[PDB]
Design a binder for these strands. Structure first.
Length: 45
DNA sequence: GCTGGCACGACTTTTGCACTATAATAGATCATGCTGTTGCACAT
């Protein structure tokens, strides 16, 4: 907030916790072989 | 006859060659890109 943000908005700095989006058809895939790494690998056909 | 600016034979000055243990000091963030090390995923 405040206005170390008009600078922040114009610098196009990535936020700490970005939100991921999807594509044309996000069908259900949950996660195939969700190992100890990043789990729930979404694979919408 | 008296005087005041010009040259000459020693002396004097200039110039290239030329080689030569102790200590000011540390109190911003903030972001970005690169490098090295480690852990996750696949293969015979």
């Amino acid at each position: 907030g405040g206005l170390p943000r008009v600078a922040d908005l114009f610098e196009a700095r990535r936020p700490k916790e970005p939100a991921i989006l999807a594509e044309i058809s996000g069908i259900v895939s949950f996660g195939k072989e969700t190992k100890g790494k990043r789990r729930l690998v979404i694979t919408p056909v």
